[PDB]
Design a protein around this ligand. Sequence first.
Ligand SMILES: [Ca+2]
Ligand SMILES: [Ca+2]
Ligand SMILES: [Cu+2]
Ligand SMILES: [Cu+2]
Ligand SMILES: [Sr+2]
Ligand SMILES: [Sr+2]
Lengths: 718, 720
Amino acid sequence: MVPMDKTLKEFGADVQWDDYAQLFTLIKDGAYVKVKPGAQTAIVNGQPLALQVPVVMKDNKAWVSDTFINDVFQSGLDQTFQVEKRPHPLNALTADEIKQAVEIVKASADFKPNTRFTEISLLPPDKEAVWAFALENKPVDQPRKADVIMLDGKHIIEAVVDLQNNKLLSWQPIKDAHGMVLLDDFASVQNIINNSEEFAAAVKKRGITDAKKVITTPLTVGYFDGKDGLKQDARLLKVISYLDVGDGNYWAHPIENLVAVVDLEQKKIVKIEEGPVVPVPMTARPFDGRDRVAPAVKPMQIIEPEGKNYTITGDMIHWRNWDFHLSMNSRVGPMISTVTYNDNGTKRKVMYEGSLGGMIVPYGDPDIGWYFKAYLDSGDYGMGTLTSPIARGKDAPSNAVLLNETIADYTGVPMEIPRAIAVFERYAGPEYKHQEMGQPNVSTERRELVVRWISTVGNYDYIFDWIFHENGTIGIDAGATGIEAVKGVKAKTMHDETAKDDTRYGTLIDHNIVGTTHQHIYNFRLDLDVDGENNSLVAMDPVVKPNTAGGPRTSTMQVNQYNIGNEQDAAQKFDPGTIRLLSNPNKENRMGNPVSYQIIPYAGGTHPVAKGAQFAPDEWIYHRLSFMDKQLWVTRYHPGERFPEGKYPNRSTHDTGLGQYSKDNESLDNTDAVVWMTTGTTHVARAEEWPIMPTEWVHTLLKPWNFFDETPTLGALK
Amino acid sequence: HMVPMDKTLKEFGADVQWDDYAQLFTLIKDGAYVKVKPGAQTAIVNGQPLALQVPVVMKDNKAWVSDTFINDVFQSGLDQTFQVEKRPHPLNALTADEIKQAVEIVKASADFKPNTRFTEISLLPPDKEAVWAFALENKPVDQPRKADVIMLDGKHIIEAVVDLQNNKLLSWQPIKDAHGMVLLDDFASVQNIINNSEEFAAAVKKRGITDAKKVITTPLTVGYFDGKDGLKQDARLLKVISYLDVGDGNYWAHPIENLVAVVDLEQKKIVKIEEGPVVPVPMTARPFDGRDRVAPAVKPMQIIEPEGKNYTITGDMIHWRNWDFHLSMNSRVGPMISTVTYNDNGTKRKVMYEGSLGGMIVPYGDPDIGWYFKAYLDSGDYGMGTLTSPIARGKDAPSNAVLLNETIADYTGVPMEIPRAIAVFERYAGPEYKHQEMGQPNVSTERRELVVRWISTVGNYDYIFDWIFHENGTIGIDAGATGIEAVKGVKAKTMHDETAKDDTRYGTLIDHNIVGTTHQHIYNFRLDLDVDGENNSLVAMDPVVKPNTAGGPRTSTMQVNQYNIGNEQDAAQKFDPGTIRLLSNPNKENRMGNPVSYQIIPYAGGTHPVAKGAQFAPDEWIYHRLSFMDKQLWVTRYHPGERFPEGKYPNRSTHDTGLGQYSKDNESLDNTDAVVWMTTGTTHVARAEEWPIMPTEWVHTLLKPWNFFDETPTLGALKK
Ligand SMILES: [Ca+2]
Ligand SMILES: [Ca+2]
Ligand SMILES: [Cu+2]
Ligand SMILES: [Cu+2]
Ligand SMILES: [Sr+2]
Ligand SMILES: [Sr+2]
């Protein structure tokens, strides 16, 4: 025997007791259990279960067999998860493969002692073969390989290892490339600042008494052709600083106009920039509730007492008509692959690979602490690695299933992220309705399946929802919350003398605190294969035309349809009142229309919307990051073009991302296209967002357009 | 004496669940979550024990309950969701008694006549100031209940006012040139006239229809074309589009293309018939109710609140966390949200006096005979309140909703109770906010939204409206569009056929011989916001990239052009989602000295392509008559009688009597009671996926508090 509540709760399950029915309801992920004290059986997801040892109440607390959790939860009656006997080829590197891959490169003579690992990822087999596995179950007969990107001090080396034959295939130093920021870079930064008298001296003049309460925060310095006075070949980071005052929120305590430049290889400050002295804002601004009492609230549960409609086999997810593969990358996070829609018995391709391509959070302030500030979260910091374990019931609904995911840390040791991804089905209003006058109503409810992932980088937290509608539509939403980066200012209200200058670049959200204006710009890489590899990009611009057909009408609503033939033309602004299809010239629906998916890069947002990059076309950030200033891109599929901002965007001098990918202006006619959607907000701060910002959402959509022959949700014929 | 539980509870409208293992019934109905065991002497209502004289009885696997079980339980009082109102809110709708009274009073007048019908019988609104004072200070409105009675005498409109407190007629005003909306007996009348028409049956025969009794008609308003349509301006007319009933329950899927009959409702006779080319009626059966479909298995998913709701409904007053508002029902525009305040640490702060659907238009873009005049002003011309569609419990709204009934007057002046007319439901909407500081304990709270949902159906469209209250002070308004499409009969089976290009010039070919004629849905919401008070100003904030004049390597910066919008004419404008438009109160500021404001977002997105305006050339009449179609934002000085964007009597109107009229005098909007109007819509290009039945498509609008508060609104009560 072992006590129930204690055991169940260490296991992560939710325990409810109902005195009226003398019934225990146990819930974890897909398993929904009902068990009575002294009963010889139980119920798991609607199904009966014989028990070796019944539950016994001693002194009013239940006691269970030391074998209970296994017997009941791993009983096999929770069918949410199934064994994958034949591993999908896109499956992420396992802990073993991660360790194997590190052994191989550590065994080369070229591997230098304190080398770190920026990324250790599956080297993807060729697309054709993966599709073949998913559609025909044809074994992919190449060995598992891994890209091993190393950082030797400040030097980038790309290696490829063969895991089947346990041997090194190649070792390539990458010239002029800078490495992303690694975890230990954060400690140096702080450690190096701590040991500098010059810095302790600057801090003191700034009105700070205890230098050991100063918090560093490291930032990439971008590239300014030398105008920032920084060397190109040295590995650099700028340091912004705050003051810990004990409120658990150093962000609310900026030390404005103090910037330190740190050379991570000389391990010392190579430059201090000082500006007007500003009193650090002192007022405690906690956000974690320490100073609050939440109002009582009636409970709300979302229950699926017979288990889930989806089934997770290894990393393969089957839900209704959808099948797809969900894996984890240390840089961009989740990757949705081999997505198909089962049209009445036939699996048709929709998407080969979909994922966050890359993002950036650039600021609009000229001053010394801000002008270089632009966050390439995934690219520079690694958003997968910094995944934030989903908080059960809060970050995701009470009926979610939470998945664990494994990647490699910067020292090459496997790393299991708990509750890394949330999978939950949700009611989304009525799928469709007609109430014909004097007739029985017709209503069916809409279900969506959501794959939710949260990554936290410094002060923001970002949420991403990959949303699968029953009817074939796929949504992609990005949410933003967390703590704003604020500029310390003298003014305490808008009546103060400095208020005007103080707010030229942001709103005054708290006394002495201004939320500098910025943008959030997300870019999603979507290798759609619309009912096949070979597609074309078609515009339909609804327009008003003169009526030629007679009658009283002077005008009509018609459409301008034309193919978009190349990559340069495909890289365009998006007008939400126009229609953009990726069509399959080769296949047609019942009515003779090319099967297509409608692409909607802006389907709404709760913050103001970016129409492009709020940067003059001669700014360096603008020249380097093209993807910011166009909402739609379409390129020819090539296996190594995956990042809108480039593979090595840290202090890049030119554009190696979508700018480079479309530079060559290849043709997009009946060929394999990759869609890139850029959507962003322009954030003008306000008091309601301080000291912690309510989640703001942006929406994007991919709709079937004559992909089907009718309403996809009516069902099969009798 | 006893009765079958299961059947009785179904009539009564409650969900029933039997758990054989626990031998336990779980019963659900609105705010009532009940648990009862067979033979047990007590039951559980919202977590509270209730005693039963007569327990539930199991008899050969059939449950049985006494004939008072349903009252004893669901009206016990342990369900605290609904409370009774001590002092009646002055904004409460006309009761059934008040309706019947207002009708007696006018029938007592010299000039009343037996054919006279009632287009709208609605409370004459008390003055804003008295009403507010009631909500905020609790001061009795000492002004007497009156009711606006709009009658239709044959084809003439008359506006009568009745004093209900004193049971007297106050006024009786004939309105020249005004045409009345379409009424219910109009539908019946039109079908009859066609069925008695010798010519029409002949026209129908030519077009391959072998049985005319099978011809389903449908009435549309005709609009105005300065006589170009050949229609005398002053007669009460309706054009008639026709379909063939094939027994598939979907007559919409079988158009009789190019046959249009004009009907004079006074003459009760077909005054004109327009005929075009003969096009074979699409015959294939295309039901949407699933009769020909397989019902797959779906595992159950309940959203439950077993201790009751967080909101309370007292009369028509709804209280939920910091929100307080009054909810009622107009026969024309449906639900009305009034005296909306937000409670800030003890003090109720004004947010909105009155919000509701202003009006909507669904105009088509095809110039042919059966399409060129076609634009529906659904609320204005057909009365959307009256055509409210009862909520399909569990489907049209989630399993944890409470469904309100609402009472209006019908067209003969008889009270009419609409069951499940409005849905109220709280919903989880992700994390309110979150920060997971590296190395630290996470911080996350869940977001809750209270939704007020209403569905009205007009012919083939079904529209859904959500009024959404975020705990953090934000208000959302989404409009959903579903139902069946008005399709055009054409000759082409596929795009390969010879006439495919011609047949699809004005719409997509979504099925053999069927085209989804392009059109738009344009919604407009009239929002009498009072941001922390009546006197407001409209402010603009345009994020711009200005050259950097402060040194450093930056060539440019992100700054903001702020300016007031001083008058109505300037306030009537397009909305660019990259800009910020506030309704600020210039008399009140937050802790930081910023004017407390609400940010107004008429376009927060949608699932159909968005309409940038009216897709009409600027010389079309419908464009002329309806200026509200072409700007997304309007603000006007509050005036009690200015409620409709399309104008109060839009049927065959000849000039804008709505938002064009309201703002034409270009009044000042500086520090004055403002009314905000938001227009938003979709351009609907059809696709096979939307046939035979259209998946619900949504558009979102948003109202965010902007420096209205001093801090994150949902942090919680301060401990010091
Ligand atoms: Ca592709
Ligand atoms: Ca107002
Ligand atoms: Cu932001
Ligand atoms: Cu439509
Ligand atoms: Sr290319
Ligand atoms: Sr006016």
